[PDB]
Design an enzyme around this catalytic site. Structure first.
Site, PDB file in Angstrom:
ATOM      1  N   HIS A   1       6.164 -34.815  -2.919  1.00 28.36           N
ATOM      2  CA  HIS A   1       5.534 -36.158  -3.101  1.00 28.36           C
ATOM      3  C   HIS A   1       5.478 -36.597  -4.587  1.00 28.36           C
ATOM      4  CE1 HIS A   1       1.592 -33.827  -3.095  1.00 28.36           C
ATOM      5  NE2 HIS A   1       1.310 -34.738  -4.044  1.00 28.36           N
TER       6      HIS A   1
ATOM      7  N   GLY B   1      -5.617 -34.827  -8.649  1.00 28.16           N
ATOM      8  CA  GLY B   1      -5.391 -34.189  -9.964  1.00 28.16           C
ATOM      9  C   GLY B   1      -4.938 -32.734  -9.841  1.00 28.16           C
TER      10      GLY B   1
ATOM     11  N   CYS C   1      -2.847 -31.432  -7.468  1.00 30.09           N
ATOM     12  CA  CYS C   1      -1.542 -31.182  -6.795  1.00 30.09           C
ATOM     13  C   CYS C   1      -0.589 -30.496  -7.780  1.00 30.09           C
ATOM     14  CB  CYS C   1      -0.911 -32.422  -6.168  1.00 30.09           C
ATOM     15  SG  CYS C   1      -1.878 -33.079  -4.782  1.00 30.09           S
TER      16      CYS C   1
ATOM     17  N   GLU D   1       7.497 -29.482   1.726  1.00 30.21           N
ATOM     18  CA  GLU D   1       6.733 -30.156   0.627  1.00 30.21           C
ATOM     19  C   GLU D   1       6.954 -29.466  -0.730  1.00 30.21           C
ATOM     20  OE1 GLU D   1       5.665 -32.993   1.095  1.00 30.21           O
ATOM     21  OE2 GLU D   1       4.729 -33.292  -0.914  1.00 30.21           O
TER      22      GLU D   1
END
Ligand SMILES: Cc1nnc2n1CCNC2
Length: 182
Positions: free
Chosen positions: A41, A146, A148, A72
Site C-alpha cells: 500500500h 504512522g 506501517c 501485502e
C-alpha cells in the site's frame, strides 16, 4: 530494557531506512545488498526518497501467494551506493506463532519507538482495507497511523512488517526466508 528490545534495536540501527512515497513515510526494512521490503500500500514508483535522498528504484515486485492472493509485501531493489547488513539468516522458514514480540518503528513522526506487543497469532486470512490478504500475524496492541512498515521481531527472529490495525489489534505480513533466495 531486555533481550527482546536488544535484538529489535540491532535490526533498527543497521537494517532500517525512512522510505517516502506519494502515500507518506514508512519504516522500510533492508534485508541484504540493495534489497528492502515495504507494505504494498506504499505504492512504490520509479523514484522513492530514502532518508530524504532521491533514489531510483531498479526493480520492484509485489509478493502474492500461489492462490493468487495479496501478501501485502513489496520487495524493492534500490539504486543506493551502500549494501545492507545481510539479515536473511534471521528470517523464519515456515508460518508460525510466537511469544514475546516487539514492534519497532523509525519515522520523522515516531523516532526510536519500540512496542512490546506480546503473543503473536498465525491469523491467516484477513480482509485488509477491503483486500483479501494471506499470511497475516495478529497481536493485541492498539497500533495507529504512522506504524506501517514497522518491524516485528522476537529474540533471534525478524518475523513480519506491520501493515494495519482495527484499533484493538495490529496485523503484520509474514516475512519468510524463501522470499529472498537470490
Ligand atoms: C531481490 C528481489 N527478490 N525478488 C525481487 N527482487 C528485486 C526485483 N523484484 C522482485
Amino acid at each position: 530494557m531486555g533481550p527482546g528490545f536488544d535484538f529489535a534495536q540491532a535490526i533498527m540501527k543497521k537494517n532500517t531506512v525512512i522510505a517516502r512515497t506519494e502515500k507518506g513515510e514508512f519504516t522500510m526494512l533492508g534485508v541484504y545488498d540493495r534489497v528492502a521490503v515495504i507494505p504494498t500500500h506504499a505504492s512504490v514508483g520509479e523514484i522513492i526518497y530514502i532518508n530524504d535522498v532521491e533514489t531510483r528504484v531498479l526493480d520492484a515486485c509485489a509478493l502474492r501467494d500461489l492462490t493468487d492472493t495479496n501478501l501485502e509485501i513489496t520487495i524493492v531493489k534500490l539504486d543506493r551506493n551502500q549494501k545492507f547488513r545481510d539479515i536473511r539468516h534471521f528470517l523464519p522458514r515456515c508460518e508460525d506463532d510466537y511469544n514475546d514480540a516487539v514492534l519497532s518503528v523509525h519515522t520523522s513522526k515516531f523516532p526510536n519507538m519500540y512496542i512490546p506487543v506480546g503473543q503473536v497469532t498465525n491469523y491467516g486470512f484477513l480482509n485488509l482495507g477491503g483486500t483479501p490478504t494471506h499470511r497475516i500475524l495478529m497481536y493485541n496492541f492498539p497500533t495507529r497511523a504512522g506504524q506501517c512498515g514497522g518491524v516485528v521481531t522476537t529474540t533471534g527472529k525478524v518475523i513480519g512488517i506491520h501493515v494495519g490495525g482495527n484499533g484493538a489489534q495490529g496485523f503484520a505480513a509474514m516475512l519468510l526466508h524463501s522470499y529472498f533466495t537470490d
